[PDB]
Write a protein that binds this ligand. Structure first.
Ligand SMILES: [K+]
Ligand SMILES: [K+]
Lengths: 454, 452
């Protein structure tokens, strides 16, 4: 035959047995291993042995039988033997030499041969013949082999390599309308609202909202705006928790992004009185999905994944683990808080971890009451927190995401009526800050590590 | 032992080291092209054609893809202790050489792969298991990046790949978090002692983006990855002073970027404690003065900036572009040539401010910045509080449209005379009419500049 010729090299025969039957039934002439040729022929499907077209060698029990000149010339020449080259590789930690080389050869000779390495690319390769799609298949193959080899590299030296293939989420633009977006790797979420439109900014808002909500020590809810929390609550009553988080900074929460750490149900969904742009939860009842999707809320259900701080800078991807620090708080000065109040303090540090730095936050009775974030100085963060809290600061507790560099931020908080603060230590003026705490009668707890989050 | 298989593109680059190996008693085998090159330079080499059936299919394209060669690499008793392959540069796509290299790496306990001078020099010396494992990882890291480059030749942006780079970072964003840097960064650090931190690098990136395309000589000071102060003008010493003093309390520990050469005079003028200074170049006298301080000196090269982050295990990126298009006067009296310069300066700086951001500037310097806010009204409020009396007669920029007239009213009440912002609110009509009512001049920006 001079057309519809396919060379196959398969590790998983039984996956692809129904497909190869169809192919041969649709006039495809199949070439394969001496072994696979037999299987198929036993399975009633006619197939040709590539061994017949190259010299025979018995080196290393068959390890190099693909690595022959006639096979590669049959792919790389201007008049190739095969129109499609399909290779299904062993999974990690196996390292394949010949199969990978077959795929790359086919992609190299993309104007004459179509490579395929999975079900979707096989289907395209079988159907399509246009230049634009041939280039796409070639691109896809080298994208696949790049990722394949990154995985193998990391098997030898952990973290030596990073590699992704572009994913289509159908983003209309990036951060702003005049900017293009590129998403790399499949995201660990399901989109549950009708039509599934999602934006670049939605995804980054939802990441922070979700990290924080997952990071909450009990039933809780976080509202994000512009990638920083504007409100958060914890409690036992889901409808009330959500009401509290939303109303904490009521002016900002319109169009906000809500993440909860419990299943979103019909009662909670119907209780919403504020348009929210995105809702994120571990699960949604079907009834909740209907109510919310009908209200143009976008809905994300995350799976398990690791979060990372950092960005591209100077053409490098500069990444950091994102961790809420382990370690007990340590009373430094003042009367100890009651257990109830210490839980407010822990809650406050968990929320301030997610707040954009410099951040200072004030909370009481399981809800935030004033957040200052995104500030170039610690004193400014404290000031904004107190302004937003007003009289709600009286008797409240506060958290700072880094150490107080000077006593002034502490005076701002105490004058507002804050009774206790948590922060890391580490300043050259720690003694002076602690003495100011003592003077003002505010209780000071040392946090185990800083939680900058830019 | 001491057997090496060599396939070279950059022949002259490795001639000297190959001579050394042969003088040190290595037995050299080579691709036939490499084999004759070495011979014409007086180096004995064994042509691998010797151990395989001769063919010249497609004029030599497949000479390497022969079972005897791969069996000699992959078996438990290999023919070669080192496999050295240097690949053709882009846009060429290598099949046989990449396969040789990957085969050597696969059989890492028995064969040592190399692909450049660095890895060759290790492969020649070492035999320990840890170092053999490192050579294999390096090789697959290399072939991953090679193939990424090739993918993107076919479909732009379909692939992203990097090798890990050592920047000597002690930790990431906070001391209890690990840092990973991917790809060689387009900067040089000039400073003996303390290194640049994870946070310092991100601060410096925003400072530089903002300074680099100012409409004239300019300086930007950043704290916590957002501008705290900026200035443009005609006198380098004066520009830096103004930028530093604009929010003088916050500039302590700042990251200063200038779009001009850092010289002795400017260097001597700096009194404020700074973490980093970014400049396109530094004179030697400037480096001498500044080396008395702890401050890190960063000299950037050329590269593309990107917004975005990891989210849900995906890398989610956006272009970062200051938007092209002239501002359009919507209502009020047109500004003077000078004030319009102030207005563009203000929009360039608010592009780099964390959203929601509003800023006020006058006579080429920022006077108040409200940034990282959950609402636009709050941003405007902080900007005006910070500016105080300096907002009278000033200009303002907003990184996104005013959703209600209230934000515009806060600025007018402080004495701001003109604003630049995108339009696009359902209440654009009310916003514009409020600007008209208040006698504030409104220029429409071509596009939004959120920057979170
Ligand atoms: K934080
Ligand atoms: K901005």
């Amino acid at each position: 035959h001079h057309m519809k010729r396919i060379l196959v090299s398969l590790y998983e025969k039984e996956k692809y047995l129904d497909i190869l039957r169809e192919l041969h039934e649709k006039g495809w002439e199949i070439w394969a291993s001496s072994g696979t040729a037999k299987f198929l022929k036993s399975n009633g499907i006619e197939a040709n042995d590539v061994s017949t077209i190259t010299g025979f060698e018995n080196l290393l029990g068959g390890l190099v039988k693909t690595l022959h000149p006639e096979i590669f010339a049959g792919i790389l020449g201007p008049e190739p033997r095969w129109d499609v080259v399909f290779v299904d590789l062993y999974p990690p930690p196996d390292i394949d030499i010949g199969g990978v080389a077959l795929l790359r050869a086919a992609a190299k000779n993309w104007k004459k041969v179509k490579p395929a390495f999975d079900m979707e690319t096989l289907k395209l390769a079988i159907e399509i013949d246009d230049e634009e799609t041939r280039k796409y298949l070639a691109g896809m193959t080298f994208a696949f082999t790049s990722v394949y080899d990154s995985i193998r590299a990391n098997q030898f030296v952990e973290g030596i390599s990073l590699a992704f293939k572009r994913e289509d989420l159908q983003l209309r633009y990036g951060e702003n309308p005049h900017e293009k977006a590129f998403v790399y790797g499949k995201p660990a979420f399901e989109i549950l609202h009708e039509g599934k439109t999602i934006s670049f900014n939605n995804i980054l808002d939802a990441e922070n909202a979700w990290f924080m909500a997952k990071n909450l020590p009990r039933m809780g809810a976080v509202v994000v705006k512009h990638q920083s929390p504007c409100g958060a609550a914890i409690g036992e009553d889901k409808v009330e928790i959500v009401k509290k988080a939303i109303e904490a900074d009521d002016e900002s929460s319109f169009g906000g992004i809500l993440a909860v750490n419990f299943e979103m149900d019909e009662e909670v969904a119907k209780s919403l009185k504020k348009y929210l742009e995105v809702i994120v939860a571990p699960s949604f009842t079907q009834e909740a999905i209907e109510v919310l999707s009908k209200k143009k809320v976008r809905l994300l259900k995350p799976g398990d994944y690791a979060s990372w701080a950092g960005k591209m800078a100077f053409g490098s991807l500069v990444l950091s683990e994102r961790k809420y620090p382990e370690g007990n708080f340590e009373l430094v000065v003042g009367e100890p808080l009651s257990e109830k109040e210490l839980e407010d303090l822990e809650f406050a540090y968990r929320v301030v971890e997610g707040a954009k730095s410099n951040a200072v936050l004030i909370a009481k009775d399981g809800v935030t009451v004033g957040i200052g974030s995104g500030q170039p100085s610690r004193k400014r963060a404290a000031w904004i927190a107190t302004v937003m809290a007003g009289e709600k600061a009286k008797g409240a507790v506060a958290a700072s995401d880094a150490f107080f560099p000077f006593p002034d931020s502490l005076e701002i908080l105490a004058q507002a009526g804050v009774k206790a603060v948590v922060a890391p230590l580490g300043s050259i003026r720690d003694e002076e800050v602690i003495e100011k705490a003592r003077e003002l009668g505010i209780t000071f707890y040392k946090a185990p590590s800083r939680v900058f989050r830019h």
